[PDB]
Amino acid sequence: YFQGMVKHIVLFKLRDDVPVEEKLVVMNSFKEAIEALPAKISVIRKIEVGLNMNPGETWNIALYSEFDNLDDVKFYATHPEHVAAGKILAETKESRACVDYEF
Template sequence: MVKHIVLFKLKDNVSEAEKLVVMKKFKAAIEALPAKISVIRKIEVGLNINPDETWNIALNSEFDTLEDVKFYATHPDHVAAGKILAETKESRACVDYEF
């Protein structure tokens, strides 16, 4: 099994209200993906409630193989969900590990 964890930081010049709208829309889109992408074993999106921390969004997901992660990453429905953050995302960090 592979755990795929991604953190997103949104731009500082985006208002908190706009960030929250984008974050909720992204969360809903990502958490709807298991119905469309069969290789997803588990997926959840957490929205950071601690303003003292750097990262705004945490995505935690599980797959059988790294090949499944790559399939998910390029799937059109995942790509569309990622575009929700396109205008507001400043940076992204990712770790894939076996467990």
Template sequence: MVKHIVLFKLKDEAPADKKLAAMNDFKSAIEALPAKISVIRKIEVGLNMNPAETWSIALYSEFDTLDDVKYYATHPEHVAAGKLIAEVKESRACVDYEE
């Protein structure tokens, strides 16, 4: 099994209401993906509640293989979900590891 963890940092200068709306839209879109992308075994999105921390969004997902992660990453539904935070996203960090 491959675990795919992604953290997103949002732009400090983006308006708080715009960031919150984008975060909630992104969470809803990502968590709806298992019904559209069969290779997803598990997925969840956490929105950081601690303003003292750097990262705003954590995405945790599980796949059978790294090829499945690559398929998911390029799937049009996933790409569309990513665009929901594009304007407010500053950076992204990702780790994929096998259990």
């Protein structure tokens, strides 16, 4: 059945020339920071970070999340706790891909 809710999906790729250990530190710190946000950002219905484990793929980090509506996605996006979490990627990030869709 149709939920009338929104999935916010983001994939990130880090630069190729970042050392392995730095990619791991960044990815682990970002995953922890993001997954702690529900205690601080009330509109998050579900959130998780997945780290790529397929060596045939080149992107690094997936953020899978659910919100009631797009206003709530925007509330989350600019929330100070979320902005802090996103800065974790600032030095190493190469690309961001995002789709927001209804389910």
